[PDB]
Amino acid sequence: KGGVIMDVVNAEQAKIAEAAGAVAVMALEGGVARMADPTVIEEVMNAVSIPVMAKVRIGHYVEARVLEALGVDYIDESEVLTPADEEFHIDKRQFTVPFVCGCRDLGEAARRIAEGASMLRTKGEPGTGNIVEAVRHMRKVNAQIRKVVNMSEDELVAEAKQLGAPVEVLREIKRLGRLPVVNFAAGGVTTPADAALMMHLGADGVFVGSGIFKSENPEKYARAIVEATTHYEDYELIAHLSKGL
Amino acid sequence: KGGVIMDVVNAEQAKIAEAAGAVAVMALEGGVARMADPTVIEEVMNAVSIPVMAKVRIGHYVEARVLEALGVDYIDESEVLTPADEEFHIDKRQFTVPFVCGCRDLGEAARRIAEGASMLRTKGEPGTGNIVEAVRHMRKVNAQIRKVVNMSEDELVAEAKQLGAPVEVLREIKRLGRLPVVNFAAGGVTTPADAALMMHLGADGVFVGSGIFKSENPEKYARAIVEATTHYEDYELIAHLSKGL
Amino acid sequence: KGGVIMDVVNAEQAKIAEAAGAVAVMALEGGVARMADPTVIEEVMNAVSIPVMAKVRIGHYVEARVLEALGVDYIDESEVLTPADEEFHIDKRQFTVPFVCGCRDLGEAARRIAEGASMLRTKGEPGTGNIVEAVRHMRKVNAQIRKVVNMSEDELVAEAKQLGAPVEVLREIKRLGRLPVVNFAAGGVTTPADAALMMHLGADGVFVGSGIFKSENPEKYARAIVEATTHYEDYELIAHLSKGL
Amino acid sequence: KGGVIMDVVNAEQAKIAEAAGAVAVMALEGGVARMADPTVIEEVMNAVSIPVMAKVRIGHYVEARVLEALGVDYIDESEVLTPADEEFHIDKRQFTVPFVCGCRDLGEAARRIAEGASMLRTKGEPGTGNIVEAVRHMRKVNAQIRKVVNMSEDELVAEAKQLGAPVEVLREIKRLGRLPVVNFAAGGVTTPADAALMMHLGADGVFVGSGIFKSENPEKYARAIVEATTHYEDYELIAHLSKGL
Amino acid sequence: KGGVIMDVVNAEQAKIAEAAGAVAVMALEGGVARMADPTVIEEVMNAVSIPVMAKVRIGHYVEARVLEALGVDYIDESEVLTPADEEFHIDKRQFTVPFVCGCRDLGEAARRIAEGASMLRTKGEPGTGNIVEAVRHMRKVNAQIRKVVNMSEDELVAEAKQLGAPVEVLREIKRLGRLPVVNFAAGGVTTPADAALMMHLGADGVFVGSGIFKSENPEKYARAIVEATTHYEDYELIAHLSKGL
């Protein structure tokens, strides 16, 4: 627990991610942002042994089935791609391949899960290098979990109504003490301190973007995030990793 | 199917109800309207072989355990009694005695079912002799059910959010082609034509009030309601039953 | 835990209360509602050995010193009397005699405690025989307590701000896992089931009003409430205590 | 310090007030409420040796000069009479006879003083037997005094602006630590505890109304107020005086 | 009392600050503004013997642990960095290293103290060379302190509510007659007169920014500010220190 998933655009970057100890890679391709070209997905697939993920536009059922047929390990039904369906998410229950979805609060989390999400992440604010929204979303979802875990049983139906959440998801949360799926922080995680902060806030792990490869030394920067995420209470070690970019 | 349940206040009324063909009786007592006196409930229980129901205030957990312990067959957690809890209904799952609840729409119905209701009824507008609200509720609920039954499966999570309904309950409705519990019309049902109309609109049956016994010949009037609810497409009989009160 | 406090207007009522097992009595006596005549309070003090409470107007510092000087065991700074100070409550920390105070939510509770309150009760809706408001307040305070006990420590300062609560009281709640004072349900508690219900919602006991003595047999009634409040999960007992009015 | 002034309507009542130790009497006469008939003022004047006051309508310059010519000791420019001038108070600086005026806050106090008031009182809420407004006004004026006494000197001009107060009055207040005139509580003071409460709140004394003579024993009731006002921290004695009406 | 803290970007500047008599240095280094590179902070720690401060993003718990682990003497949880958590500040009570925090009013100050802050400063308007905001905040905090010191004890609970302040911090202020921590002016302090002015408004000292080193003679300038801040009523001295820019 406490893994790092890393956005990669080619073979080279994928190998650097696996070598630095990333638990998975996310293969990436007002223009329209669609599912990545097959050859990009299969070029990344052939570079590593750790799980390969890729993105589809929200609601894009057939994009997902294409990714599934291509043999991806995981599908991000991604708000950062251009939504295909602004009202209905993919019925992920129908897929053999697992999905991760974004969320900002427990209502949203519960709905994605009712749709069949196998994994969750914060939406954060990608491309900004700013964790403030990632923090907001993890704070909100976790504070709401803590409320649910400890509230009177008979108050759950009303709670679900107010949250716009499926009540059976709340009941399962209360039974387990946590979400029935893992929840990673994502969006703006830049520094070793950022990465450890998400773990401190209750994240199960962390997604990071292409900023790692904007670096002088992607290897060392990737390593620093992986170690800071793993050893997230070693403030002495974290203080060290924050040096020299 | 096409059962009638009658409001009764003493043994004599309970016997008339039963002899007339009612499938159950409901025993009944700025004033606060609470649980009936145990002696009234036992008096009615002693009078008939058919099931006896009684009412508790909404959210009044203990009033419901009292009635459960007194051996009633069914509890109506009822909006006509002064509500005890304005925010939370009784967690009816924790009871061995079955409960009936009122609703006005599919969201409301699903929430009551999620709380553990074993039976539903329209809220209607009791005391007026006016079926207009009962018709509205039965129309609304059944129209929303027909919509759910036929809707695209991938659209039910969004639909559940819009209704404030637990999606699992919507998914069961779709699976069964109808509500998982019987839904009776209740409120204002006065004439043989009223009772038959509620059946025409899709009720599983009908609750009627004390008006029967304000009548000149309550036996005849009770039989009329029972016969019309059963033979609800028999207009020639319903016409006959309407003559002479 | 499971105490009943009874409102009494004279010695006779006070002895009935003590003998039925009350843990204390509230000595009582549209115009202005002020502190009772001392005579009435002295008459009650002499009748019984259990603690005796009386009421003062909100913010009426001198009324409180008068009751203290008379030797009452507890002061209710009471909102059912005509407030004397609409901005500032009594600085109860300056008193050797303990105060009980009304509340509706945790922020209100927390401020009363910070003024010196030693005991709390719901404000409820006195005089109505209706528990709906008492239920709302108990439900609200306890839900917020549950939330506070279980929330991140570093979120308590923000929470106190939002609630209008002193954060030290909130930190003390988290530390104990409940309020640092006892909290009785008050307002409208009428039947054995109501008294039991309040305890089910997590009250520490119940205040009850003069309705007991409007009864055909106040001793049987007073006792029934005492038994209900203490054996609040004894459903079969409660059911029996409901009969014989 | 800590005197009681008493409203009287005749010789008899005036003598009872002096005999009970009142420091002064106020001679009293949608109808129009004007200055009292001379013969009422002179009948009260001839009954006692302690100062006699009487009321004029706000802004009624000539009423005041009549009272002055009749030889009253003090003039209340009284909001309880029907105002003669809704924009301009009497220029009391022009009178040899001293005036008391009402107030609800420091701005108002300062303005009345700039007009030449020799004494102030709270407006309270006369005729209600309710001290809540008297409390509000004394609280407000005294809290504002405490603010002024201790604030940076250079912030006084802006403070005067915000309060709508003459700055030289604020400066004089800051110099003295208090108002340059006495300030009595008035309106609704009913019980010995009320009277002592005003003294506790920082009043210089107390006005009381015709309620004293609504009593079984005006003598004893008057005495009780006078003693409670004088000995306002003797909670033992006050507790005693609160008995037997 | 009369300390100057200086913002420095390197060792050279840090030694200039120490030698001119600074009581501490703030080590510093549109995109995201995060905690400085440790290298920069280590370089400053080695240059001087006076206490060294650095900044973290608001709510950035891990950044604060990193600076603690590096051995800085003080942490500024700083609003001029890009906030990491917009709801919850760092629980500074959990730290052995002391924090300074910005504020604009007493309620804000009081909440920071209740989170653990050991020192305060005005937020001011950094970067502008304009003291108007620093003046507003110092003026506001001190005016409210003065008011709180001198107000009725029993009015503090209401006051805390209105201010959004924890009442325990307000009671502690009244007890001491000032803040339980020191409070420096920060933002726009440019000239000797500004530095002196802040002290005149009742600051405990002054933070100053990088403008010192934009000077033709930073040593003379740094020293002039140190002398102005400490001898803040020495008008003739201050006037001389204004010449020779």
| Mutation target among A142, A197, A221 for the E interface, most CBs of E within 10 A | A197
What letter represents residue B27's amino acid?
A: A
Contact call for A150 and C155, based on CB within 8 A: no
Task: Answer whether D131 sits within 8 Å of C84, measured CB to CB.
Answer: yes
The answer to whether C132 contacts chain B (CB < 8 Å) is yes
Nearest CB to B157 within list A114, A153, A161: A114
Which residues span the domain enclosing B110? 1-245
Asked whether the beta carbons of C90 and C151 are under 8 A apart, the reply is no
Using the Cβ of E215 and the Cβ atoms of chain D, whether some distance falls under 8 Å is answered with: no
Distance (Å) from the alpha carbon of E33 to chain C's nearest alpha carbon? 23
Among the partner-chain residues C139, C142, C151, the one whose CB lies closest to the CB of A143 is C151
Size of interface D-E (CB pairs under 8 A): 26
Chains A and C touching, counted as 3 or more CB pairs less than 8 Å apart: yes
Q: Do chains D and B touch (3 or more CB pairs under 8 A)?
A: no
- Residue B172: which region, alpha, beta or left (left: phi > 0; alpha: psi -120 to 50)? alpha
CB nearest to C150's CB, from A149, A152, A155: A149
Query: Which residues on E lie below 8 Å from C87 (Cβ)?
Result: 155, 158
Q: Do D190 and C69 touch (CB under 8 A)?
A: no
Distance, CA of C11 to CA of B213 (rounded, Å): 49
Asked if A132 lies within 8 A of E39 by C-beta distance, the reply is no
Tokens of B39: 């002696």
d(C-alpha D208, C-alpha D214), whole Å: 12
Find the catalytic residue in E1, E55, E140, E243: E55
Rounded CA-CA distance D27/D210 in Å is 11
Q: How far apart are CA A55 and CA A78, in angstroms?
A: 6
Distance to chain D for E155, nearest Cα, Å: 9
Contacts by A138-142, CB closer than 8 A, 24 or more apart: A138/A183, A138/A185, A138/A198, A138/A201, A138/A202, A138/A203, A139/A201, A139/C155, A139/E85, A139/E87, A139/E88, A140/A104, A140/A105, A140/A106, A141/A103, A141/A104, A141/A105, A141/A106, A141/A109, A141/A179, A141/A183, A142/A201, A142/A202, A142/C152
User: DSSP assignment, residue D185?
Assistant: B
**Interface contact C152, partner A, CB < 8 A:** yes
By CB atoms closer than 10 A (0-12, 13-18, 19+), residue E140 is middle
Using a CB-CB cut-off of 8 Å, the residues of chain B touching C135 are 59, 84-86
Tokens of A242: 């924050």
All partners of chain E with 3 or more CB pairs under 8 angstroms: A, C, D
The closest alpha carbon to A200, from D129, E63, C223, E105, belongs to E63
How many CB atoms are located within 10 Å of the residue E71 CB? Answer: 12
| Both tokens assigned to D68 | 């002055």
CB < 8 Å to C61, chain E: 154
Active site residue D174: no
Q: DSSP H helical segments within chain A, as ranges?
A: 11-19, 38-45, 61-70, 106-114, 132-150, 156-163, 167-176, 192-200, 218-230, 235-241
Instruction: Kindly determine whether residue C168 and residue E164, on different chains, have CB atoms separated by under 8 Å.
Output: no
DSSP secondary structure code for residue D210 in this structure: G
> Helices C167-176 & C156-163, crossing angle to 10 degrees?
120
E111/C87 touch (CB, cutoff 8 Å), yes or no: no
**Chain C contact for B38 (CB, 8 A cutoff):** yes
Instruction: Residue E216: count other Cβ atoms within 10 Å of its Cβ.
Output: 8
DSSP per-residue string spanning chain B: --EEEEEESSHHHHHHHHHTT-SEEEE-------S--HHHHHHHHHH-SS-EEEEEETT-HHHHHHHHHTT-SEEEEETTSPPS-SS----GGG-SS-EEEEESSHHHHHHHHHTT-SEEEE---TTSS-THHHHHHHHHHHHHHHHHHHS-GGGHHHHHHHHT--HHHHHHHHHHTS-SS-EEEESS--SHHHHHHHHHTT-SEEEE-THHHHSSSHHHHHHHHHHHHHTTT-HHHHHHHHTT-
Q: A90 at the B interface (CB within 8 A)?
A: yes
What lies within 8 Å, CB to CB, of A5 at 6+ separation is A22, A23, A24, A25, A26, A53, A184, A205, A206, A207, A208
Method by which the model was determined? X-ray
Termini Cα distance of chain C:
25
Nearest to E56 by CA among E29, E30, E94, E96: E29
CA distance C3 to E166: 33
Closest approach of chain E CAs to the CA of D243, in angstroms? Answer: 28
Separation CA E39–CA C119 (nearest Å): 56
Contacts with E162 (C-beta within 8 Å, 6 or more apart), sequence order: none
Which residue stretches of chain C are H helix? 11-20, 38-45, 61-70, 106-115, 132-150, 156-163, 167-176, 192-200, 218-230, 235-242
Half-sphere exposure of D6 (CA within 13 A, CB side): 34
Which residues of chain B lie closer than 8 angstroms to C193, CB-CB?
35, 60, 62-63, 66
8 A C-beta contact, residue E201 and residue C202: no
**If we measure between CA atoms, which residue out of E114, E134, E132 comes closest to residue E124?**
E134
CB contact under 8 A, E146 and D150: yes
Report d(CA B166, CA B134) in Å as an integer: 23
Q: Which site among D122, D130, D240 would you substitute to test the C interface, given the most C Cβ atoms closer than 10 Å to its Cβ?
A: D130
Please give the Cα distance from C44 to C38 (Å, whole number): 10
CB atoms C235 and B65 under 8 Å: yes
Report yes or no: E181 at the D interface, CB cutoff 8 Å: no
In chain B, residues with a C-beta closer than 8 Å to the C-beta of C136 are 85-87
CA–CA gap between residue E217 and residue C18 (Å, rounded) = 87
Give the span between the Cα atoms of B76 and B53, in whole angstroms: 7
Nominal resolution in Å?
2.2
Helix (H, G, I), strand (E, B) or coil at C166: coil
Q: Six-digit token pair at C241?
A: 């205590």
Which residues of chain E have a CB within 8 Å of the CB of D150?
Answer: 146-147, 149-150
Q: Cβ separation of B161 and A161 shorter than 8 Å? A: no
Number of structural domains (chain D) is 1
> CA torsion sign, B225 to B226 to B228 to B232?
positive
Strand order, beta sheet including A24-27: A182-184, A119-122, A99-103, A74-78, A52-57, A24-27, A3-8, A205-208
Amino acid occupying residue B116: G
Tokens of A227: 């170690």
Contact between residue D148 and residue D110 where contact means Cβ atoms under 8 Å apart: no
- Out of B59, B66, B70, closest to residue C135 by CB: B59
Residue of B32, B35, B8 lying closest to B19 (CA atoms):
B8
| CATH number of the domain to which D201 belongs | 3.20.20.70
